[PDB]
Amino acid sequence: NAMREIISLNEGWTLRFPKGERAAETVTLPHTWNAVDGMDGNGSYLRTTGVYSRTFKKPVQPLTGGRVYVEVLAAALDATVKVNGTVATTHEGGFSIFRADITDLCRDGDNELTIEVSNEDTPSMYPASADFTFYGGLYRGVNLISVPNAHFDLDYYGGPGIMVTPKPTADGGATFEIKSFVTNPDDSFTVMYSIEDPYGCEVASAVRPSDNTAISIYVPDAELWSMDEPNLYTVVARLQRNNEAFDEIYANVGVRSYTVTPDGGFSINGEATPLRGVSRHQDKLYKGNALTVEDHYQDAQIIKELGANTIRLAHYQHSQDFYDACDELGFAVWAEIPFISVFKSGKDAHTHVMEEMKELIIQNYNHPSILFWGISNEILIGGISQELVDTHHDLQKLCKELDPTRLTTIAHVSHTPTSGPMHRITDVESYNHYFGWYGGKIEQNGPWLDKFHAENPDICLGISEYGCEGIINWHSNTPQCKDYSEEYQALYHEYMAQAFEDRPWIWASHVWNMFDFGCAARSEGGVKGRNNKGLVTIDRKTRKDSFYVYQAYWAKDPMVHIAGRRHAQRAGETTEVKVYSNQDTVTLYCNGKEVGTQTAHRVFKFDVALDEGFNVLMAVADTVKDSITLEKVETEPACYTLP
Amino acid sequence: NAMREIISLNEGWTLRFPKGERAAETVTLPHTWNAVDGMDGNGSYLRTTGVYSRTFKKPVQPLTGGRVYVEVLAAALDATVKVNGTVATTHEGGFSIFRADITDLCRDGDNELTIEVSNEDTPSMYPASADFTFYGGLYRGVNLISVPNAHFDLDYYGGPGIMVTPKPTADGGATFEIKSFVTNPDDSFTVMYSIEDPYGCEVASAVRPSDNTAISIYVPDAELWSMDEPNLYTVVARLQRNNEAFDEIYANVGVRSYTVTPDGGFSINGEATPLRGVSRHQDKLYKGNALTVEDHYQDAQIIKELGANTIRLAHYQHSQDFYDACDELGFAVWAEIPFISVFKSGKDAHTHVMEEMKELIIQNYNHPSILFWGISNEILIGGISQELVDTHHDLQKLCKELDPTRLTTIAHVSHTPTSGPMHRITDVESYNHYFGWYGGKIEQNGPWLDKFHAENPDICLGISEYGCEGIINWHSNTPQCKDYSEEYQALYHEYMAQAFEDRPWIWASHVWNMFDFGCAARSEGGVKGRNNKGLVTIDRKTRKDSFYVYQAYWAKDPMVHIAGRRHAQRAGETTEVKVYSNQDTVTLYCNGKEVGTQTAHRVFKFDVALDEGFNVLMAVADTVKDSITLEKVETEPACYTLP
Amino acid sequence: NAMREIISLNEGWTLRFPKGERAAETVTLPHTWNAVDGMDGNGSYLRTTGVYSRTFKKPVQPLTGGRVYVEVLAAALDATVKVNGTVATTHEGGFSIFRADITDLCRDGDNELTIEVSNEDTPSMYPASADFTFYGGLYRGVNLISVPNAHFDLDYYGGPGIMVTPKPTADGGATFEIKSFVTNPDDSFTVMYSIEDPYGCEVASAVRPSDNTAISIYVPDAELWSMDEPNLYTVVARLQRNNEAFDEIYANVGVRSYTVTPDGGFSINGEATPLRGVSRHQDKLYKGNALTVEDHYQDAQIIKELGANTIRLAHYQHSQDFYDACDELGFAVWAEIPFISVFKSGKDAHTHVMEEMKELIIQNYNHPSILFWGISNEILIGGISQELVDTHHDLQKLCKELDPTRLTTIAHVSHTPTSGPMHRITDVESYNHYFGWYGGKIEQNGPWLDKFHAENPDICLGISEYGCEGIINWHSNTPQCKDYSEEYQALYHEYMAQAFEDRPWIWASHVWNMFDFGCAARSEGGVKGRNNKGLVTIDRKTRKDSFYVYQAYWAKDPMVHIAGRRHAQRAGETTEVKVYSNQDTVTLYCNGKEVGTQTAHRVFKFDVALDEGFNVLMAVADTVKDSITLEKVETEPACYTLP
């Protein structure tokens, strides 16, 4: 990128543990020391200080005055960077980029880079109390940046050096208000802005002095961004002297406007579009949170095939890779900070939360997929206080100071009083409800929504979490709460899918959660270490039957799915064979004999007298078919039921 | 794949020779120490004991109970594997996968793997008497396999741990009878089966207990497999515990039925499809048999262009890569064991042949291209025995016990009595005939076939070997047996191609051989160390005129080939210019003047009066043209005739 | 390629300087020690002796007789190759391939290779007096070549070992006159020639004795080569023995014929096609001339988008990568030797130019893009002598002995007398003019051309250099010579582009230059170390407004460009907004308000009264649009004018 050089420093590390809990080991980044114990259900996970260290050569610039920066893409939870013995920087918060100018700590030839990382609790730390593992370490990798003396800003909250506000115009075009930030500007430097259309062709440009960089650029005939058509432009910014580019940065951006109203729900680009989707944690089976770029895009593609149009990226800042995948595949994204569960008093905990929100907005400001900033999750679990409420006003004020182009949101714990000072702080609001799993009946969800909506017709209500555990080796002919069966989780989501389709004024609903994820503290349903409320398993391999409920309710590609394939052995004179489809007519066959034809909306239930022995079940929708094999048995195996 | 990990161990080996024939060398697998002396004509090839050794790091499973296996893809001919000095396993037979569980012999960190390979004869060994170099060493590569304690079986005759039997159903679907094999099954483990269509979409599924894994899965509207349309399905098997896959394995398979009848020949999926093809050895110029996956696919592609629809994979188990290429590209494959030439009596020789066949079947059961198991080649060269006959009955019974879905076959040496105990053992039978090369006249082939067919109307007769040496620096105007010319080899195959077209009741015919191959004992026709009966040279570069004979008879894409280009200088008032085409009318031009137009079936002979000096011969078929240059000389060069 | 094995030796080098100007450094090829100081404007560049040194392993051939060559792709400007301390060869000339047979200097295992390179002047050296940096070192890389004892010639002038002369025939075909050159030919070796068509299919073949290889091969229905449709054939040659390829070389070639007449200009394949294009140097920003293959193709792609159909590759032999890029992308290439500015008298200098010319023709004879051999550039700067004129006639004779199929050309310095001995030597002739930049006025160019053509109606007149410096931080409301402004360089090329469009009898015009390039001696217009006459900056990143003039005049894809975006702040009651387009009607809008509509040929000038503040200038052509932002100011910045 012009004279800017980015060198990956992911290889060649030794991880030591000063308190001796593990022998030294050589590792490659991305890395966490909790990749296994953070989700194997041993009972705990190692929280402590791990020291990473490696050697690097000092990068060299052709021209005098070069500068060297180390870029950590995340250090969970607390970090100190040393070059050749001397502290270069410290950082708190384990989900955001931070950088350090290590120019003057560098010598020619080999240098030593030392990063102390701690995932231990501290008086100012968030997260501290949550239902998910705090994987320690350098789980996103580390970069070396070489730039000339004049270069776009690398020092401001790990930001990109450029902010872009695209807006549609009445005449069918778009304005891109752009500002970039130059370290050591000077009258001999300009900033040349160029905008490239989705196909790579330049469509607009403008030029500014390097010390006065704000400009608004107009693109005619703009291709708007939406979840269905995520059209992207590329803003390129070049720091120029004479006929030479010194620095170059760029940003993918999208043009969209959007509204949420209490009676109307969500609209984007003037079209009513109810947000129906999922939440997603950042871990994977025995990798901890140390995911590759392929991991992130694979998650995104699975969620796209589901037919979701929104993703709540709880409970922290995610990878640039996953925001990139959202911009490109088209999802409405809710991004949030880990201000979770239990308010911690003090100036330092207040400073942590504000800094983390400042980094979340500045590092992710250019992503068109991000529509909502979330300021807390379930913060009343630890009890309300005046101090806690003031922090939420401070955070609301910061989001509108930093970014008035986006809506603020909040996720309430289930028992949050439906009046009180926690409402009307943010532009929109959501509740985390588990009626039918942690308490109550499934049939309570609908009336709860209707009642709150009627009593608060000025609040935009969404559901930021709802869900139910499903452990796919348990299977019940009489599925009920706390049997943990795949069938009961499907019944829960059968109701909710239809509940949210009945209520477009719910601006967004988010299944908790897309995937099973790791929580060291969990033990229930015969499994340790896990939240198993996923529509898909933690290794991304197995779609539960709940997944196909949503696929039939959301996806447009024709599909037909026979539920209960893992209920392989069925006892009884008849058994219910359930089919999900986005077609409206399903014919079921059993060993070639027609069982029946039904016309229904999404869910189809057939009573089937299985033949003795093995049975081919074939469901014929319109252009799609499905087929599974079931076995009639006298008594179903002991292993289909929790001990 | 789930928690299964396969690591390539092809790098960083040291090859030593205990008896001192060579200095120690560092090698990379695939490797044979006979890559040069096995085909360079020096006189002999080194048969001895080579010792390979390298270090490897112990792989780590995230959960407790991890197991480690070493996988040797092939070791020619006899091997002993040691880990840290201790013997892990021994294996006899040089063409098939074997594995050892080395868990208890591994320590943390670096381990030492040592493999002692011998290609010397033993009282047990097959091959022992054949016309091809027994290249020695680790010529397919080595893998390391990490698996959890519960995993698909790794210990059974080097197999994949799954067997899949697809059959077409009457209503246009397919049943897949699947059985998988689990080491340490358990009530908490299930096997989840999934079937993907050629385009990667799931079309059917079933689930089973891990100690009772057999299931039949029906796929509607199945896409059938044939040599013209090799549609493949993927069967995936996952070992599942709760919401987590422990192990995963998979098999590409095709849906086809087929028949051979003595009068009707070969049918596949209901259509009479005479099998007309070639054999193929597994070596390549100065590589020995240490071929890469690209080499195998290159061979497959060259055979596909030839228009061949069957490949005889003589005389041993070939690479998985090549069976994969036959499944993907579509060839009817005859697969066989090296039970060749001279029968060795003794219980140990018996065990060898029985186990090599068992490995052949279990390691290749899932390939749809394999249609025929061949139990022996030319086994009466060493005289018939009652032990010999009984071993053939044992192999026939073994083949039908392990795999009733395929047909057995045998290749008789030319002088085998057409009556007697070697007939009616296998389902179909072939002969190796060389009338017109090893004696006899070309014109006896046709009558011989018709006499056998007329006398043994209950036998399905094929021709597994026929061919003729062709060395392309020798050229003759009066081509005759033993001048070794390219022209005589073409005349031989001109006749044979037409003979097999006339006889659809020959179930299969295989040219010996597709490529020149290495045999260290050969010395004839002015060349040492080669069998030069190939249609294509041993470096895969030059197609002989014999190749284009078969292309014209077999290939569907229009082509046209002027023969005799390497007969560059022609003497005589007229010279014959021969053209091969799969179009039916050829106009020949000589320096732009029209020489003749003919309508013929495949073969076109023109008598041409060449102008003095150089002549442009252009042949014009319907939509294609060919062009070569010839020179008119007074005396042809001495270098065109064997000395 | 058969038994030929090409190994790159670009890694693992140490570079020392005997005279101690620098410390020892390890380097990778391609490399030059003048990568930075040759274009940073410090004042000078290091011309000394650098000694590169690495160790390599002797390659092994499977048969006795193996040979080892070292191939240096270029060494600027003088080199000596040693293997294990023994001189293998010496070379003069910094831009052509040279090889050494090092078979006998080699021992088994590790050997040491030393290459002393010096870029200082010598009595025989060209280049010596020129406006570009003589970057020193191994700026194209080094190869090791292993061949059998019989192989295609590696010892004749760095040549490819084969020459191919394709010519179209009247019946729509093509003849390929082929000669290859075999070292240690022999009666058992034949050369087998094959011609593959653009799509990889063999269309023609011939075979020859290896002591007598010349042959003409006819291809029917030939696909012609042209700049618009650069169809390429592949000629393949194989050294064959028995059934085994010993060596293999190949060449990509194209079929074209072309003419130049004084009154008709240039024609290719019978269609008049004026050559309008650019020159190109081989350096890039702080890379010196150590360019990668991507750098070469990137330059070619940029020139293709510009719409040029001709590239003058001054002032030396360029890399094979770029000649390939011109063969593949389609440009008429003028290639030349660095016989520039000042004639050196004496026999060694004369030998230098004759040998460098010979290397140019032999190494590039097969490239269909090359149409013109250039013998000298501006050679009368140092005065005419009898000996200069003689050396020019020697070069003409050498060109027509080596290559009668191409046209010779020459580049005259501006003041070269329009009569006399420097004219009518070569087939065509060019002048380097800079009327309007080094003197005179822009409007003199047109009349000059018309006077020469009137006076010399038998000379084919081209313009091999013209241009004007443009430094893009300088902007002027009254552009004039020596303000160095982007606007004035644009005015220049606006006139010149229309000048050559008006004169199709100019056979070729070449803009000096396509890119800015490095000249250590230069210091002017506020920039040091640079010739800044490029249409595009030296880092390939920024197209000057001059670039879009030529794009409008040459390119076919619709485009529209508002000039002067870097004149970003504009003073005056009105400002001129200039637009370039290859559409003929442009509507300009200022902040949504129409300013005017014009129908012009390529260049559009609008007088705009800007609004106070920021202004959106949008230009609407037929199917394309352009948009830029301008600011109205009272006083334009100080930094738009040279101090």
Ligand SMILES: Cc1cc2nc3c(=O)[nH]c(=O)nc-3n(C[C@H](O)[C@H](O)[C@H](O)COP(=O)(O)O)c2cc1C
């Ligand atoms: C999205 C966004 C990105 C920003 N990036 C930068 C930046 O990279 N560099 C910078 O100096 N200021 C940046 N700013 C602006 C600063 O917030 C503000 O102008 C001023 O520097 C106050 O800095 P403070 O937050 O340290 O008080 C950015 C502002 C926003 C909203």
Ligand SMILES: Cc1cc2nc3c(=O)[nH]c(=O)nc-3n(C[C@H](O)[C@H](O)[C@H](O)COP(=O)(O)O)c2cc1C
């Ligand atoms: C194609 C094929 C693959 C087989 N793979 C296995 C296997 O992986 N593990 C196993 O225990 N049996 C496997 N079997 C079946 C065995 O033959 C079976 O265990 C048999 O009853 C035991 O006989 P044996 O142990 O003497 O071979 C396979 C059978 C076939 C036909």
Ligand SMILES: Cc1cc2nc3c(=O)[nH]c(=O)nc-3n(C[C@H](O)[C@H](O)[C@H](O)COP(=O)(O)O)c2cc1C
């Ligand atoms: C394009 C071209 C390539 C040539 N390549 C070779 C070659 O590789 N080897 C060779 O012996 N001659 C080659 N020649 C021809 C030589 O000029 C020829 O051998 C000549 O008689 C040698 O003369 P010399 O030894 O005085 O240079 C080539 C000629 C041309 C025009």
